[PDB]
């Protein structure tokens, strides 16, 4: 179970996510071509680094 660093490309505006959770589109730090969208709580901005544990699922709404 490795730990994948990742960085925010775009915060997403009109997802309809519940409350403090905001969806975000993140591009990996190892293979920077692969990018997925993921749910994020807390204040997040463009171009900052997240740490995620499970990479296999693309996050729903």
């Amino acid at each position: 179970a490795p730990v994948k660093f990742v960085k925010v490309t775009r915060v997403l505006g009109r997802t309809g996510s519940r409350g403090g959770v905001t969806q975000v589109r993140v591009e990996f730090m190892d293979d920077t071509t692969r990018s997925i969208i993921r749910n994020v709580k807390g204040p997040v901005r463009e171009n900052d680094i997240l740490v995620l544990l499970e990479s296999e699922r693309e996050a729903r709404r």
């Binding site: 009109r14 997802t15 309809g16 709404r61």
Partner: peptide, 17 residues
């Protein structure tokens, strides 16, 4: 729900194809 709407319609069309 707009993106989820067009995504599920894309999947419906893909199974139809």
């Amino acid at each position: 729900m707009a993106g989820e709407r067009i995504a599920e319609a894309l999947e419906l069309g893909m199974t139809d194809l």
